[PDB]
mmCIF file of N, CA and C in Angstrom:
data_model
loop_
_atom_site.group_PDB
_atom_site.id
_atom_site.type_symbol
_atom_site.label_atom_id
_atom_site.label_comp_id
_atom_site.label_asym_id
_atom_site.label_seq_id
_atom_site.Cartn_x
_atom_site.Cartn_y
_atom_site.Cartn_z
ATOM 1 N N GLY Q 1 33.018 18.414 14.619
ATOM 2 C CA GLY Q 1 32.554 17.052 14.162
ATOM 3 C C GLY Q 1 32.711 15.987 15.250
ATOM 4 N N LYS Q 2 33.747 15.283 15.122
ATOM 5 C CA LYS Q 2 34.066 14.155 16.188
ATOM 6 C C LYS Q 2 32.989 13.167 16.254
ATOM 7 N N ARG Q 3 32.779 12.454 15.112
ATOM 8 C CA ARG Q 3 31.794 11.400 15.013
ATOM 9 C C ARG Q 3 32.085 10.207 15.862
ATOM 10 N N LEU Q 4 31.154 9.796 16.578
ATOM 11 C CA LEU Q 4 31.488 8.457 17.481
ATOM 12 C C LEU Q 4 30.381 7.377 17.044
ATOM 13 N N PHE Q 5 30.971 6.178 16.923
ATOM 14 C CA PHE Q 5 30.137 5.136 16.484
ATOM 15 C C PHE Q 5 29.184 4.758 17.525
ATOM 16 N N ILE Q 6 27.903 4.870 17.301
ATOM 17 C CA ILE Q 6 26.890 4.544 18.159
ATOM 18 C C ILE Q 6 26.673 3.007 18.157
ATOM 19 N N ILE Q 7 27.055 2.434 19.380
ATOM 20 C CA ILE Q 7 26.873 1.026 19.494
ATOM 21 C C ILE Q 7 25.382 0.686 19.685
ATOM 22 N N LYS Q 8 24.965 -0.252 18.693
ATOM 23 C CA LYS Q 8 23.577 -0.631 18.580
ATOM 24 C C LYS Q 8 23.379 -2.058 18.323
ATOM 25 N N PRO Q 9 22.314 -2.789 18.633
ATOM 26 C CA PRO Q 9 22.127 -3.992 18.146
ATOM 27 C C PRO Q 9 21.876 -4.127 16.719
ATOM 28 N N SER Q 10 22.005 -5.336 16.131
ATOM 29 C CA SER Q 10 22.044 -5.444 14.680
ATOM 30 C C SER Q 10 20.576 -5.205 14.170
ATOM 31 N N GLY Q 11 20.343 -4.194 13.424
ATOM 32 C CA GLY Q 11 19.008 -3.983 12.874
ATOM 33 C C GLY Q 11 18.633 -4.470 11.558
ATOM 34 N N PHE Q 12 19.585 -5.472 11.034
ATOM 35 C CA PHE Q 12 19.178 -5.981 9.702
ATOM 36 C C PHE Q 12 18.023 -6.967 9.735
ATOM 37 N N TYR Q 13 17.883 -7.716 10.846
ATOM 38 C CA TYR Q 13 17.064 -8.964 10.834
ATOM 39 C C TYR Q 13 15.659 -8.491 11.054
ATOM 40 N N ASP Q 14 15.279 -7.612 11.919
ATOM 41 C CA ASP Q 14 13.886 -7.150 12.060
ATOM 42 C C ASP Q 14 13.492 -6.270 10.838
ATOM 43 N N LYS Q 15 14.326 -5.426 10.306
ATOM 44 C CA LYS Q 15 13.954 -4.789 9.022
ATOM 45 C C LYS Q 15 13.673 -5.740 7.902
ATOM 46 N N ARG Q 16 14.527 -6.822 7.760
ATOM 47 C CA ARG Q 16 14.235 -7.776 6.719
ATOM 48 C C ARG Q 16 12.989 -8.475 6.961
ATOM 49 N N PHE Q 17 12.677 -8.891 8.213
ATOM 50 C CA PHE Q 17 11.347 -9.534 8.477
ATOM 51 C C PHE Q 17 10.168 -8.599 8.106
ATOM 52 N N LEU Q 18 10.291 -7.267 8.586
ATOM 53 C CA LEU Q 18 9.232 -6.350 8.364
ATOM 54 C C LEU Q 18 8.884 -6.137 6.785
ATOM 55 N N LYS Q 19 10.048 -6.057 6.066
ATOM 56 C CA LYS Q 19 10.045 -5.754 4.668
ATOM 57 C C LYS Q 19 9.420 -7.056 3.955
ATOM 58 N N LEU Q 20 9.780 -8.220 4.258
ATOM 59 C CA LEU Q 20 9.262 -9.417 3.621
ATOM 60 C C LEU Q 20 7.802 -9.613 4.077
ATOM 61 N N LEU Q 21 7.466 -9.325 5.216
ATOM 62 C CA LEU Q 21 6.092 -9.482 5.757
ATOM 63 C C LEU Q 21 5.141 -8.484 4.956
ATOM 64 N N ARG Q 22 5.660 -7.203 4.774
ATOM 65 C CA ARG Q 22 4.863 -6.309 4.030
ATOM 66 C C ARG Q 22 4.817 -6.673 2.556
ATOM 67 N N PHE Q 23 5.888 -7.108 1.964
ATOM 68 C CA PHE Q 23 5.840 -7.602 0.603
ATOM 69 C C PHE Q 23 4.801 -8.724 0.358
ATOM 70 N N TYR Q 24 4.871 -9.742 1.236
ATOM 71 C CA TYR Q 24 3.969 -10.901 1.072
ATOM 72 C C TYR Q 24 2.488 -10.572 1.432
ATOM 73 N N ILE Q 25 2.288 -9.601 2.374
ATOM 74 C CA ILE Q 25 0.936 -9.186 2.524
ATOM 75 C C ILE Q 25 0.374 -8.472 1.355
ATOM 76 N N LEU Q 26 1.210 -7.532 0.808
ATOM 77 C CA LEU Q 26 0.758 -6.680 -0.204
ATOM 78 C C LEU Q 26 0.680 -7.384 -1.655
ATOM 79 N N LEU Q 27 1.466 -8.445 -1.813
ATOM 80 C CA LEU Q 27 1.360 -9.214 -3.110
ATOM 81 C C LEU Q 27 0.052 -9.806 -3.448
ATOM 82 N N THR Q 28 -0.634 -10.076 -2.405
ATOM 83 C CA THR Q 28 -2.092 -10.577 -2.516
ATOM 84 C C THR Q 28 -3.046 -9.557 -2.096
ATOM 85 N N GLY Q 29 -2.687 -8.675 -1.175
ATOM 86 C CA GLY Q 29 -3.648 -7.575 -0.921
ATOM 87 C C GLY Q 29 -4.023 -6.709 -2.026
ATOM 88 N N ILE Q 30 -3.070 -6.234 -2.835
ATOM 89 C CA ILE Q 30 -3.201 -5.402 -3.995
ATOM 90 C C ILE Q 30 -4.183 -6.106 -5.064
ATOM 91 N N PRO Q 31 -3.977 -7.328 -5.597
ATOM 92 C CA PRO Q 31 -4.883 -7.946 -6.506
ATOM 93 C C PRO Q 31 -6.359 -8.129 -5.996
ATOM 94 N N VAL Q 32 -6.434 -8.509 -4.719
ATOM 95 C CA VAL Q 32 -7.707 -8.854 -4.157
ATOM 96 C C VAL Q 32 -8.562 -7.380 -4.048
ATOM 97 N N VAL Q 33 -7.887 -6.315 -3.628
ATOM 98 C CA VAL Q 33 -8.604 -5.106 -3.560
ATOM 99 C C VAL Q 33 -8.816 -4.458 -4.925
ATOM 100 N N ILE Q 34 -8.037 -4.836 -5.819
ATOM 101 C CA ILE Q 34 -8.303 -4.397 -7.252
ATOM 102 C C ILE Q 34 -9.582 -5.102 -7.827
ATOM 103 N N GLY Q 35 -9.591 -6.470 -7.500
ATOM 104 C CA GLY Q 35 -10.782 -7.204 -7.862
ATOM 105 C C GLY Q 35 -12.061 -6.741 -7.221
ATOM 106 N N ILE Q 36 -11.877 -6.390 -5.925
ATOM 107 C CA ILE Q 36 -12.969 -5.840 -5.143
ATOM 108 C C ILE Q 36 -13.584 -4.559 -5.717
ATOM 109 N N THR Q 37 -12.625 -3.587 -6.068
ATOM 110 C CA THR Q 37 -13.114 -2.272 -6.539
ATOM 111 C C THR Q 37 -13.550 -2.410 -8.007
ATOM 112 N N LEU Q 38 -13.097 -3.473 -8.705
ATOM 113 C CA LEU Q 38 -13.664 -3.608 -10.020
ATOM 114 C C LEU Q 38 -14.967 -4.288 -9.955
ATOM 115 N N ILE Q 39 -15.276 -5.188 -8.975
ATOM 116 C CA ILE Q 39 -16.502 -5.703 -8.796
ATOM 117 C C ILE Q 39 -17.558 -4.596 -8.373
ATOM 118 N N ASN Q 40 -17.096 -3.867 -7.497
ATOM 119 C CA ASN Q 40 -17.965 -2.667 -7.029
ATOM 120 C C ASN Q 40 -18.195 -1.664 -8.136
ATOM 121 N N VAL Q 41 -17.340 -1.315 -8.926
ATOM 122 C CA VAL Q 41 -17.444 -0.311 -9.982
ATOM 123 C C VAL Q 41 -18.186 -0.901 -11.186
ATOM 124 N N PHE Q 42 -17.586 -1.969 -11.826
ATOM 125 C CA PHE Q 42 -18.201 -2.604 -13.097
ATOM 126 C C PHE Q 42 -19.299 -3.319 -12.880
ATOM 127 N N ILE Q 43 -19.155 -4.498 -12.162
ATOM 128 C CA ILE Q 43 -20.196 -5.433 -11.855
ATOM 129 C C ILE Q 43 -21.278 -4.801 -11.136
ATOM 130 N N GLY Q 44 -20.964 -4.200 -9.980
ATOM 131 C CA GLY Q 44 -21.861 -3.390 -9.230
ATOM 132 C C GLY Q 44 -22.760 -4.180 -8.202
ATOM 133 N N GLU Q 45 -23.498 -3.437 -7.334
ATOM 134 C CA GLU Q 45 -24.345 -4.004 -6.309
ATOM 135 C C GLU Q 45 -25.655 -4.523 -6.972
ATOM 136 N N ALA Q 46 -26.421 -5.077 -6.086
ATOM 137 C CA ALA Q 46 -27.729 -5.572 -6.500
ATOM 138 C C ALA Q 46 -28.760 -4.513 -6.195
ATOM 139 N N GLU Q 47 -30.012 -4.827 -6.628
ATOM 140 C CA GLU Q 47 -31.182 -3.747 -6.502
ATOM 141 C C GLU Q 47 -32.420 -4.540 -5.753
ATOM 142 N N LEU Q 48 -33.014 -4.024 -4.770
ATOM 143 C CA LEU Q 48 -34.094 -4.593 -4.089
ATOM 144 C C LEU Q 48 -35.331 -4.580 -4.945
ATOM 145 N N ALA Q 49 -36.026 -5.748 -5.085
ATOM 146 C CA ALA Q 49 -37.283 -5.893 -5.842
ATOM 147 C C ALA Q 49 -38.123 -6.793 -5.141
ATOM 148 N N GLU Q 50 -39.416 -6.660 -5.401
ATOM 149 C CA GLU Q 50 -40.428 -7.600 -4.761
ATOM 150 C C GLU Q 50 -40.422 -8.859 -5.517
ATOM 151 N N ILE Q 51 -40.878 -9.912 -4.912
ATOM 152 C CA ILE Q 51 -40.781 -11.203 -5.501
ATOM 153 C C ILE Q 51 -42.077 -11.367 -6.449
ATOM 154 N N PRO Q 52 -41.723 -11.708 -7.678
ATOM 155 C CA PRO Q 52 -42.876 -11.887 -8.608
ATOM 156 C C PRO Q 52 -43.571 -13.191 -8.311
ATOM 157 N N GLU Q 53 -44.836 -13.206 -8.796
ATOM 158 C CA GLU Q 53 -45.697 -14.405 -8.629
ATOM 159 C C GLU Q 53 -45.181 -15.534 -9.552
ATOM 160 N N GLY Q 54 -45.127 -16.668 -9.039
ATOM 161 C CA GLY Q 54 -44.672 -17.840 -9.832
ATOM 162 C C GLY Q 54 -43.168 -18.005 -9.902
ATOM 163 N N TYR Q 55 -42.340 -17.254 -9.127
ATOM 164 C CA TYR Q 55 -40.789 -17.373 -9.238
ATOM 165 C C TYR Q 55 -40.432 -17.897 -7.849
ATOM 166 N N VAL Q 56 -39.512 -18.874 -7.862
ATOM 167 C CA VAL Q 56 -38.868 -19.429 -6.690
ATOM 168 C C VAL Q 56 -37.302 -19.191 -6.913
ATOM 169 N N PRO Q 57 -36.735 -18.088 -6.355
ATOM 170 C CA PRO Q 57 -35.321 -17.886 -6.564
ATOM 171 C C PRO Q 57 -34.430 -18.980 -5.763
ATOM 172 N N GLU Q 58 -33.122 -18.958 -6.212
ATOM 173 C CA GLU Q 58 -32.227 -19.775 -5.594
ATOM 174 C C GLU Q 58 -31.867 -18.972 -4.318
ATOM 175 N N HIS Q 59 -31.148 -19.722 -3.413
ATOM 176 C CA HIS Q 59 -30.739 -19.050 -2.072
ATOM 177 C C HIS Q 59 -29.706 -17.864 -2.295
ATOM 178 N N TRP Q 60 -28.848 -17.987 -3.145
ATOM 179 C CA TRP Q 60 -27.820 -16.956 -3.402
ATOM 180 C C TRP Q 60 -28.449 -15.653 -4.111
ATOM 181 N N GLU Q 61 -29.618 -15.776 -4.540
ATOM 182 C CA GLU Q 61 -30.294 -14.639 -4.965
ATOM 183 C C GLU Q 61 -30.944 -13.856 -3.917
ATOM 184 N N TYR Q 62 -30.885 -14.292 -2.598
ATOM 185 C CA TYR Q 62 -31.489 -13.518 -1.596
ATOM 186 C C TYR Q 62 -30.442 -12.696 -0.911
ATOM 187 N N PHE Q 63 -29.344 -12.389 -1.654
ATOM 188 C CA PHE Q 63 -28.225 -11.645 -1.003
ATOM 189 C C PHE Q 63 -27.775 -10.541 -2.064
ATOM 190 N N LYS Q 64 -27.136 -9.479 -1.525
ATOM 191 C CA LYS Q 64 -26.897 -8.296 -2.250
ATOM 192 C C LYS Q 64 -25.529 -8.189 -3.119
ATOM 193 N N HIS Q 65 -24.420 -8.418 -2.344
ATOM 194 C CA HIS Q 65 -23.093 -8.185 -2.831
ATOM 195 C C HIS Q 65 -22.873 -9.321 -3.778
ATOM 196 N N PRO Q 66 -22.117 -9.152 -4.869
ATOM 197 C CA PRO Q 66 -21.737 -10.244 -5.870
ATOM 198 C C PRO Q 66 -20.801 -11.228 -5.200
ATOM 199 N N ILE Q 67 -19.896 -10.727 -4.324
ATOM 200 C CA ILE Q 67 -18.998 -11.726 -3.596
ATOM 201 C C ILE Q 67 -19.832 -12.587 -2.710
ATOM 202 N N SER Q 68 -20.728 -11.977 -1.893
ATOM 203 C CA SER Q 68 -21.657 -12.800 -1.034
ATOM 204 C C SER Q 68 -22.508 -13.746 -1.858
ATOM 205 N N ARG Q 69 -23.047 -13.305 -3.034
ATOM 206 C CA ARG Q 69 -23.789 -14.193 -3.961
ATOM 207 C C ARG Q 69 -22.925 -15.330 -4.384
ATOM 208 N N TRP Q 70 -21.629 -15.100 -4.817
ATOM 209 C CA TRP Q 70 -20.727 -16.167 -5.211
ATOM 210 C C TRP Q 70 -20.446 -17.139 -4.088
ATOM 211 N N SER N 2 46.168 9.574 54.047
ATOM 212 C CA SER N 2 46.247 8.306 53.362
ATOM 213 C C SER N 2 45.756 8.316 51.844
ATOM 214 N N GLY N 3 46.639 8.493 50.829
ATOM 215 C CA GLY N 3 46.234 8.515 49.530
ATOM 216 C C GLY N 3 46.213 7.175 48.895
ATOM 217 N N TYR N 4 46.530 7.166 47.550
ATOM 218 C CA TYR N 4 46.592 5.935 46.839
ATOM 219 C C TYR N 4 47.893 5.211 47.128
ATOM 220 N N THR N 5 47.837 3.999 47.381
ATOM 221 C CA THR N 5 48.961 3.096 47.439
ATOM 222 C C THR N 5 49.531 2.998 46.067
ATOM 223 N N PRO N 6 50.782 2.615 45.849
ATOM 224 C CA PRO N 6 51.356 2.515 44.528
ATOM 225 C C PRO N 6 50.747 1.488 43.624
ATOM 226 N N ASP N 7 50.153 0.365 44.229
ATOM 227 C CA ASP N 7 49.606 -0.703 43.456
ATOM 228 C C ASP N 7 48.214 -0.366 42.713
ATOM 229 N N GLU N 8 47.348 0.226 43.621
ATOM 230 C CA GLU N 8 46.067 0.807 43.070
ATOM 231 C C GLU N 8 46.352 2.001 42.173
ATOM 232 N N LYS N 9 47.314 2.843 42.486
ATOM 233 C CA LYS N 9 47.691 3.978 41.665
ATOM 234 C C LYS N 9 48.175 3.475 40.277
ATOM 235 N N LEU N 10 49.010 2.499 40.254
ATOM 236 C CA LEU N 10 49.496 1.963 38.947
ATOM 237 C C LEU N 10 48.382 1.219 38.237
ATOM 238 N N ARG N 11 47.453 0.536 38.937
ATOM 239 C CA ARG N 11 46.473 -0.047 38.175
ATOM 240 C C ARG N 11 45.431 0.930 37.592
ATOM 241 N N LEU N 12 45.141 2.011 38.326
ATOM 242 C CA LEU N 12 44.271 2.987 37.895
ATOM 243 C C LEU N 12 44.779 3.791 36.651
ATOM 244 N N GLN N 13 46.178 3.984 36.699
ATOM 245 C CA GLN N 13 46.916 4.660 35.616
ATOM 246 C C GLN N 13 46.808 3.741 34.269
ATOM 247 N N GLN N 14 47.162 2.468 34.539
ATOM 248 C CA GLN N 14 47.084 1.493 33.405
ATOM 249 C C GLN N 14 45.686 1.502 32.739
ATOM 250 N N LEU N 15 44.725 1.315 33.627
ATOM 251 C CA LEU N 15 43.321 1.177 33.195
ATOM 252 C C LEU N 15 42.909 2.589 32.527
ATOM 253 N N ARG N 16 43.555 3.830 33.038
ATOM 254 C CA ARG N 16 43.219 5.018 32.421
ATOM 255 C C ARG N 16 43.736 5.079 31.090
ATOM 256 N N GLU N 17 44.973 4.802 30.748
ATOM 257 C CA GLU N 17 45.406 5.020 29.384
ATOM 258 C C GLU N 17 44.854 3.951 28.488
ATOM 259 N N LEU N 18 44.661 2.723 28.926
ATOM 260 C CA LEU N 18 43.824 1.706 28.117
ATOM 261 C C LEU N 18 42.385 2.169 27.772
ATOM 262 N N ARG N 19 41.641 2.781 28.752
ATOM 263 C CA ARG N 19 40.423 3.299 28.495
ATOM 264 C C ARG N 19 40.403 4.441 27.592
ATOM 265 N N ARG N 20 41.423 5.237 27.654
ATOM 266 C CA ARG N 20 41.575 6.335 26.694
ATOM 267 C C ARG N 20 41.973 5.906 25.246
ATOM 268 N N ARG N 21 42.715 4.837 25.120
ATOM 269 C CA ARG N 21 43.052 4.174 23.934
ATOM 270 C C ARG N 21 41.861 3.681 23.280
ATOM 271 N N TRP N 22 40.895 2.954 24.005
ATOM 272 C CA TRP N 22 39.707 2.477 23.530
ATOM 273 C C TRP N 22 38.778 3.577 23.064
ATOM 274 N N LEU N 23 38.831 4.607 23.897
ATOM 275 C CA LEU N 23 37.825 5.884 23.601
ATOM 276 C C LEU N 23 38.171 6.451 22.311
ATOM 277 N N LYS N 24 39.572 6.701 22.105
ATOM 278 C CA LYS N 24 39.989 7.290 20.787
ATOM 279 C C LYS N 24 39.820 6.233 19.654
ATOM 280 N N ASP N 25 39.757 4.958 20.040
ATOM 281 C CA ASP N 25 39.572 3.862 19.003
ATOM 282 C C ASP N 25 38.128 3.750 18.631
ATOM 283 N N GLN N 26 37.236 4.450 19.467
ATOM 284 C CA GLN N 26 35.779 4.457 19.037
ATOM 285 C C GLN N 26 35.518 5.396 17.793
ATOM 286 N N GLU N 27 36.494 6.375 17.490
ATOM 287 C CA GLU N 27 36.325 7.255 16.337
ATOM 288 C C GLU N 27 36.400 6.554 14.998
ATOM 289 N N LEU N 28 35.493 7.058 14.097
ATOM 290 C CA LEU N 28 35.567 6.421 12.739
ATOM 291 C C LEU N 28 36.354 7.277 11.690
ATOM 292 N N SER N 29 36.733 6.609 10.721
ATOM 293 C CA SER N 29 37.373 7.341 9.551
ATOM 294 C C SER N 29 36.469 8.107 8.807
ATOM 295 N N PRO N 30 36.804 9.233 8.105
ATOM 296 C CA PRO N 30 36.010 9.997 7.225
ATOM 297 C C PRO N 30 35.353 9.303 6.136
ATOM 298 N N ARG N 31 35.992 8.327 5.657
ATOM 299 C CA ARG N 31 35.434 7.390 4.634
ATOM 300 C C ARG N 31 34.156 6.688 5.163
ATOM 301 N N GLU N 32 34.171 6.157 6.373
ATOM 302 C CA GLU N 32 32.956 5.545 6.912
ATOM 303 C C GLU N 32 31.914 6.712 7.223
ATOM 304 N N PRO N 33 30.592 6.339 7.179
ATOM 305 C CA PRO N 33 30.073 5.031 6.720
ATOM 306 C C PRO N 33 30.077 4.906 5.166
ATOM 307 N N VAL N 34 30.372 3.641 4.688
ATOM 308 C CA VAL N 34 30.235 3.301 3.256
ATOM 309 C C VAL N 34 28.775 2.927 2.974
ATOM 310 N N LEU N 35 27.929 3.964 2.791
ATOM 311 C CA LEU N 35 26.434 3.618 2.495
ATOM 312 C C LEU N 35 26.315 2.988 1.127
ATOM 313 N N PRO N 36 25.545 1.948 0.884
ATOM 314 C CA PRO N 36 25.321 1.358 -0.369
ATOM 315 C C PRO N 36 24.606 2.374 -1.268
ATOM 316 N N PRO N 37 24.935 2.329 -2.552
ATOM 317 C CA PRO N 37 24.222 3.347 -3.545
ATOM 318 C C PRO N 37 22.869 2.984 -3.672
ATOM 319 N N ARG N 38 22.030 4.011 -3.656
ATOM 320 C CA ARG N 38 20.573 3.914 -3.903
ATOM 321 C C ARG N 38 20.175 4.280 -5.343
#
C-alpha cells in the first residue's frame, strides 16, 4: 500500500467553470436543436416550382428553409 | 577531510526533519472522504 498524498493545484475552480459553461451552453442548445429538428421533420423543407403567370411573390418566398424564410 | 561537526549536525537535523515530513505525507486509511454519489 503506502498511499502518498499527491500534491496538486486546486482543481475545483476549473472544473466548476467547465461544468457551468457546459450547462449554460446546453440549456439553450437543446431547445434550439429540438426546434430545428421539429421544423425539419414536421414543418419540412420547401419545394421548387416555376413561377405562375400573374403572381408576384414576396421576397421571403424566394428561399427554401423555413428558418431562412422567417 | 570529512564533515566538520557544524555541517554534520546541520545535515543530521535536516535529515530527521525531512524524514518526519516524509512520514507526515502519509494519509490515514479513512482518507479520502469522498462525497456520496
